[PDB]
Design a protein around this ligand. Structure first.
Ligand SMILES: *[C@@H]1O[C@H](CO)[C@@H](O[C@@H]2O[C@H](CO)[C@@H](O[C@@H]3O[C@H](CO)[C@@H](O)[C@H](O[C@H]4O[C@H](CO)[C@@H](O)[C@H](O)[C@@H]4O)[C@@H]3O)[C@H](O)[C@H]2NC(C)=O)[C@H](O)[C@H]1NC(C)=O
Lengths: 48, 91
């Protein structure tokens, strides 16, 4: 009975994903959690 | 000749530092015989600001120069950070 209360349904999702581009000056940082997972965060850049 | 001046002052040759505040160009139109296309392509284009002017009979342009000295501009030293090469904090 203690097992069914302390059982998690998932492991942690918390991804401090920062993107540095040489075309810009600021780092583009997103944090992806469990509730906001499966959500694409598109960042478009016309420079290659 | 204008594009040669901006290349010499390092304006537009970078993506992180445009340096547009280091060259301003103002063109004034004197007569009714005025090509508004040629005077617009020479003047600078900065944000929320005008640099092209068209007036007639000359004497009214002399009227704008005595009027501007009656106009007092509230100078604001707040929020000014100019890029000095001694970039320690509190600068
Ligand atoms: C006027 O023009 C001159 C010539 O372009 C310009 O000189 C530049 O000065 C800056 C510093 O103000 C230099 O930047 C640094 O230079 C050192 C070597 O001296 C490098 O090691 C540095 O790289 C590291 O440091 C950075 C942070 O400081 C880090 O972000 C980086 O990842 C590295 O760890 C850094 O590049 C620059 O090299 C010179 N350029 C030249 C061509 O000499 C001067 O600053 C201009 N004046 C003004 C007010 O802008």
């Amino acid at each position: 009975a203690q097992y069914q209360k302390d059982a998690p349904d998932h492991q942690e999702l918390n991804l401090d994903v920062s993107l540095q581009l040489p075309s810009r000056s600021s780092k583009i940082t997103h944090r992806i959690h469990w509730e906001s997972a499966s959500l694409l965060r598109s960042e478009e850049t016309k420079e290659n | 000749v204008i594009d040669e001046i901006r290349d010499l002052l390092y304006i537009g040759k970078d993506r992180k530092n445009p340096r547009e505040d280091y060259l301003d160009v103002y063109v004034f139109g004197v007569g009714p015989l005025v090509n508004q296309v040629n005077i617009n392509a020479l003047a600078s284009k900065k944000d929320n600001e005008q640099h092209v002017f068209k007036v007639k009979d000359m004497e009214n342009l002399e009227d704008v120069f005595y009027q501007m000295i009656d106009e007092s501009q509230s100078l604001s030293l707040c929020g000014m950070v100019w890029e000095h090469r001694k970039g320690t904090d509190y600068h």
